[PDB]
Design a protein around this nucleic acid. Structure first.
Ligand SMILES: [Mg+2]
Ligand SMILES: [Mg+2]
Ligand SMILES: [Mg+2]
Ligand SMILES: [Mg+2]
Ligand SMILES: [Mg+2]
Ligand SMILES: [Mg+2]
Ligand SMILES: [Mg+2]
Ligand SMILES: [Mg+2]
Ligand SMILES: [Mg+2]
Ligand SMILES: [Mg+2]
Ligand SMILES: [Mg+2]
Ligand SMILES: [Mg+2]
Ligand SMILES: [Mg+2]
Ligand SMILES: [Zn+2]
Lengths: 51, 52, 115, 37, 108, 109, 95, 324
RNA sequence: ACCUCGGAGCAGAACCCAACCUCCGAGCAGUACAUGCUAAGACUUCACCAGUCAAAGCGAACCUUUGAUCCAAUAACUUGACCAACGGAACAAGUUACCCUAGGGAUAACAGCGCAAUCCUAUUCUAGAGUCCAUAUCAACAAUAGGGUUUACG
RNA sequence: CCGAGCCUGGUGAUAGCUGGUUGUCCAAGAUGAAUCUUAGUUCAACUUUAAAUUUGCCCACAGAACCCAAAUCCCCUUGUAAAUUUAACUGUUAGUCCAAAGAGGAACAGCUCUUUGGACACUAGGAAAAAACCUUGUAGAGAGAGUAAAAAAUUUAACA
RNA sequence: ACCCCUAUACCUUCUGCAUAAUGAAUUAACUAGAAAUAACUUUGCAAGGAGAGCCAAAGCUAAGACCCCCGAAACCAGACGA
């Protein structure tokens, strides 16, 4: 082994904590997507023709 | 065997509690705490509730 | 019953003959393992399956770099019969930001910064 | 079948391979001593 | 716990025993006209035994027999050395107060 | 001819291993007979279950066992030991965590 | 139970539930412990105290009772001196 | 598997097959003594402590013992269990002989050394005496760990000690109101000529004890230092605050502690008088506040819990009506 | 014969673990009559029901197993009957080859298939018989193989 | 077509029993308690979806009993990204063989039970054919390449 | 085209079926998932909602999504039959 158990204790704590912060952020950012008037109105184009 | 009996307060209160005494034993008179009076009082056996 | 196996510590105490055979110096030991999965986790206990998933060795014959530290070594000891471990050798040191995109892991276990 | 049987129980093929691989290998005492002086 | 170095730190039954020429079981019979003298000599001999580290099992008495009465006492002894037995019985011989009957009879 | 014996297990044993944080009143271990003895800030119920009397960390130790003198059988057992022998037992302690209160400024009279 | 009554076409209430359980508006069901009036002479004081208590129901038990009662029993009741008025609502409940 | 013991297992030395020939604990008290001895002894396993931790004079003494033995009246009194002892004489003799050691024990127990000198200890060689004159007829003494009210400590005390200069200091180890570690001095006499104290240099004038109300019990220390040669030194809390540690660091070369005497002071109306009249500030009142009771995280369905479960988590006891 | 509960082993060391499995025990008594009331926090027989432990506080003083609901009785407090098929139909047995229906190879008999206890065969050993004589012949206690012809078992 | 006729009606009787249950495509998805109950059901466990926020698994040291083994439990780190909770909910839930520790049987059974683990009820390669042994998995096209498991071995009696 | 190589029909019921278990000659046509409680999603309005009643401590109103077919031996009523 390169490090002893006591030397390795805590050497990755910061990175592990940031990774779990990212996981928590992704988990808690779940929320319905936006709705746009453009999407609703674009459906009128189904009857677009040539005059 | 033993019988369940109703010890009734001799303090005049309607308070009664059930004890167990041998059938062959004499009728029971026992000091017991009366909540209404808030004091230890005599209770006398009135009637046999059941046989257990 | 079948259970987890406790490997006696004497198994992981290299001898001078092993040092000569494999070419590793106990002083200044290598920093990083290259671990490849060369054996299926099927027909192996769920705990070995879980260890493999933790180490990220789901794909066989795909080298993965790990720290040569006691905890990683404990997991590797659990699943040592499914993996090939070789030290990661750095003839030119670890890659610099300039040549981070020009590295290649040679089959000998050397990460060369030229490719 | 029980672990102990009156007959020799059939080994798992893996155990059989293990036994074959770990069979005893005698040393070769150099050139055949009888043929040697 | 079994796998810990402190396994069995609390065991005691091995420390409790519940159950070179040397004598057998020795019975000292003391028949005496005096309850007081018999009891005093029994105490003295028991004290000598437990001071000299002699395994004493029982100090009972036989029932009284009338034909006046003579009170009887028993002392049980086990474990003597060569010179130790000599000193033990010579001390008993020399320390007999007045008109008492000793014995070195055996069991049964 | 063999009847009975269908009783289920009592699910006894340690409920809080060493180092576990324990609030007051938590049961630490349930035992049929005294496998573990109550240590500091650990009480005993009617049925010889160990519960935490304070909020803290559970520790297991080995300590010399001196029974209550009124425990006649234990006293006799001790009476039969040799001079050097000392009985030992496993004890469970709760190392209290918080202080039992602090003085606060309430009014600046 | 009856999902569609033969006279109204409505869902019916299992009155055995109404005779036994109290519903707190928030969704909790309260009940008495079984045997709380039986052979008290042979029960220890602690057991009697446990039996004399009003007790909440499981999530699945509550769901069953909700199914077995109709929406009338699940309304706000503003009784004069209801002993359970304070218990009808939950406070400081995180998830 | 079995890990071997990390040291001598108990009851191993005497483990012999000659149990019958081994002497046993005939008594409970001897076993208790042995058990206490083993408990005190260090061990390699986890233990409760880990977590919860001249010749002419002798000849004179022998002769005095023989004389007391010779006195037959003494034997009669002893065997009639009527004899007694002179308490004052015993107190004086103990003070002279080994009182300093006991006073050092008391100081260590009370934590003066760890809080005044950061663990550096000493011995109160000089049998110091302090007493606060109560009224005119009497004066309440200040032993090592006494209990004296601030009313009785209102005025400066009379100090007596058989010795020959001296610097006397009074500190309140725990009366500080802002910084936990600092402490307030009440009076400091310096360059005391021999025994007389009225001739001491009064560097900081006298203050009475002022332990805030409901702030517990404060320990007040009288320190007395032997002084080789005088040194010039240097109603406001900011200037009464300091640390005896660095103070005595600044003077340890020519000063050495030789006497101690401390006492416990509670609240008293004289404390109100002190806080208002001369300290000229509002008196602080402290209350011992325990932490709020622990309750497990509230569940949506408190299965099998009594009706009181909801009360455990409600904060206002008065009925609420929401939107209505 | 059993049906509920409990103790020990199987199940050695947290918990948990069956059986027509190997053994044992219980349907309460003795005690007192705070053996009261309340209440943090916990355990839990793998659900629920039920069952446990318990600080603090108040009040006297200075304890060690069996069963629900409804229903009844009592002014009430409380109490009862069985529910031992012991999670308990409030109250119901024999019989059917005269039988019927729905199914089941998840379940019997013949048969097939496993197995070889039993059975049969062959060797090894000589105890031994064979007038003596082991082995011309036969054969005990056993051992080792083989067969799948019986009786069984699945 | 009589151990109780036939027809109509109640009647679409009832059936925990058998059979059947019709477009395409993708994804997640597998072995206790009570019960007139073991051909069923309810609860649990598992499973699916959606939601909340925050630790979850692995895990060394320390720790877990006297009486009279393999391992397990517990968790700092670390490898990791999952766990818990909330809402809603069906269906599976009295399995098979293999290795191992046992029990019963006969140290029989492709035998019957409990436990740990694996595989099968899912792809492919191999062991002759082949649910359960070994290799191996995450999906398509290729007239490229390196591999995995993977083939039985044995011939033997003179005598001074 | 065959010859070569690979390849043990389908459904259902089962731990497991090429199975020498069930069903099916074949074509055409017909022949089997009906709904609440509570949720969730999307609107409306919002301490109020709803076109009386009802609900409401962000609720209420509306909509959307979700619960099969065939088969006994029987029982009874009333007729019809020597
Ligand atoms: Mg058992
Ligand atoms: Mg439970
Ligand atoms: Mg029954
Ligand atoms: Mg039953
Ligand atoms: Mg006819
Ligand atoms: Mg039908
Ligand atoms: Mg899939
Ligand atoms: Mg029943
Ligand atoms: Mg059924
Ligand atoms: Mg077919
Ligand atoms: Mg069929
Ligand atoms: Mg057909
Ligand atoms: Mg006619
Ligand atoms: Zn040669």
């Amino acid at each position: 082994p390169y490090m002893t158990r006591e030397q390795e204790r805590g050497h990755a704590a910061v990175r592990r904590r940031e990774a779990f912060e990212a996981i928590k952020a992704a988990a808690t950012s779940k929320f319905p997507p936006h709705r746009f008037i453009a999407d609703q109105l674009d459906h009128l184009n189904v009857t677009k023709k040539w005059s | 065997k033993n019988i369940l009996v109703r010890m009734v307060s001799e303090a005049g209160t309607g308070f009664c509690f059930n004890t167990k005494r041998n059938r062959l034993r004499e009728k029971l008179t026992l000091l017991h705490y009366d909540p209404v009076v808030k004091q230890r009082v005599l209770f006398v056996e009135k009637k046999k509730i059941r046989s257990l | 019953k079948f259970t987890r196996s406790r490997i006696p510590e004497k198994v992981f105490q290299a001898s001078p003959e092993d040092h000569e055979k494999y070419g590793g110096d106990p002083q200044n030991p290598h920093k990083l393992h290259i671990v490849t999965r060369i054996k299926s986790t099927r027909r192996r206990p769920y705990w070995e399956k879980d260890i493999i998933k933790m180490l990220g060795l789901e794909k066989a014959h795909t080298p993965q770099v790990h720290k040569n530290i006691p905890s990683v070594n404990a997991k590797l000891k659990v699943v040592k019969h499914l993996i090939r471990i070789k030290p990661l050798k750095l003839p030119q040191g670890l890659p610099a930001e300039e040549n981070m995109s020009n590295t290649c892991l040679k089959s000998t276990g050397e990460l060369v910064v030229q490719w | 079948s029980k672990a102990v049987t009156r007959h020799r129980r059939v080994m798992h093929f893996q155990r059989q391979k293990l036994m074959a691989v770990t069979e005893y290998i005698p040393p070769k005492p150099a050139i055949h001593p009888s043929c040697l002086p | 716990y079994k796998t810990k170095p402190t396994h069995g730190i609390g065991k005691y039954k091995h420390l409790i025993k519940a159950e070179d020429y040397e004598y057998g079981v020795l019975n000292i019979h003391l028949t005496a006209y005096d309850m007081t003298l018999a009891e005093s000599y029994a105490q003295y001999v028991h004290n000598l035994c437990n001071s000299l580290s002699i395994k004493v099992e029982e100090s009972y008495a036989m029932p009284t027999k009338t034909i006046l009465t003579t009170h009887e006492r028993v002392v049980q002894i086990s474990g003597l050395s060569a010179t130790f037995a000599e000193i033990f019985l010579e001390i008993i011989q020399s320390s007999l107060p007045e008109g008492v009957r000793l014995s070195v009879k055996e069991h049964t | 001819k063999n009847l009975g014996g269908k009783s289920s297990g009592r699910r006894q044993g340690i409920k809080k291993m060493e180092g576990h944080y324990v609030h007051a009143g938590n049961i630490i271990a349930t035992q049929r007979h005294f496998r573990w003895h109550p240590g500091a800030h650990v009480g005993v119920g009617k049925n010889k279950c160990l519960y935490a009397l304070e909020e803290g960390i559970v520790r297991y130790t080995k300590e010399v066992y001196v029974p209550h003198p009124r425990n006649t059988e234990a006293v006799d057992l001790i009476t039969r030991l040799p001079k050097g022998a000392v009985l030992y037992k496993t004890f469970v302690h709760v190392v209290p965590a918080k202080p039992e209160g602090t003085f606060k400024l309430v009014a600046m009279l | 139970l009856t999902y569609f009554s033969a006279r109204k076409g409505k869902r019916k209430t299992v009155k055995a539930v109404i005779d036994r359980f109290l519903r707190l508006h928030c969704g909790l069901w309260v009940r008495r412990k079984a045997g709380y009036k039986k052979k008290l002479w042979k029960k220890t004081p602690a057991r009697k105290k446990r039996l004399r208590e009003f007790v909440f129901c499981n999530k699945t038990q509550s769901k069953l009772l909700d199914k077995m009662t109709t929406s009338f029993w699940k309304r706000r009741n503003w009784y004069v001196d209801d002993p359970y008025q304070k218990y009808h609502d939950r406070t400081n409940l995180k998830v | 598997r079995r890990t071997p013991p990390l040291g001598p297992m108990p009851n191993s030395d005497i483990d012999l097959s000659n149990l019958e020939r081994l002497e046993k604990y005939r008594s409970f008290d001897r076993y208790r003594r042995r058990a206490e001895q083993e408990a005190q002894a260090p061990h390699w396993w986890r233990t409760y402590r880990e977590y919860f931790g001249r010749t002419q004079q002798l000849l004179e003494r022998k002769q005095a013992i023989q004389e007391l033995r010779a006195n037959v009246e003494e034997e009669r009194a002893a065997r009639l269990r009527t004899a007694s002892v002179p308490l004052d004489a015993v107190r004086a003799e103990w003070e002279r002989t080994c009182g300093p050691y006991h006073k050092q024990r008391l100081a260590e127990y009370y934590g003066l050394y760890r809080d005044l000198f950061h663990g550096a200890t000493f011995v109160p060689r000089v049998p110091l005496h302090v007493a606060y004159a109560v009224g005119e007829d009497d004066l309440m003494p200040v032993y090592c760990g006494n209990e004296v009210t601030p009313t009785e400590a209102a005025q400066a005390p009379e100090v007596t000690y058989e010795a020959e200069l001296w610097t006397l200091l009074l500190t309140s180890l725990d009366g500080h109101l802002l910084e936990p570690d600092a402490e307030y001095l009440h009076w400091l006499l310096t360059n005391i000529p021999g025994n007389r104290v009225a001739e001491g240099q009064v560097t900081c004038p006298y203050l009475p004890p002022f332990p805030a109300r409901g702030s517990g019990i404060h320990r007040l220390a009288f320190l007395l230092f032997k002084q080789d040669q005088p040194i010039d030194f240097s109603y406001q809390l900011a200037q009464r605050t300091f640390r005896t540690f660095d103070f005595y660091k600044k003077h340890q070369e020519t000063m050495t502690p030789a006497g101690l005497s401390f006492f416990q002071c509670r609240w008293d109306d004289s404390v109100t008088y002190i806080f208002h009249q001369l300290l000229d500030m509002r008196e602080p009142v402290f209350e011992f506040v325990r932490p709020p009771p622990y309750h497990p995280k509230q569940k949506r369905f408190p299965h099998r819990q009594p009706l009181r479960y909801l009360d455990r988590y409600r904060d206002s006891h008065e009925p609420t009506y929401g939107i209505y």
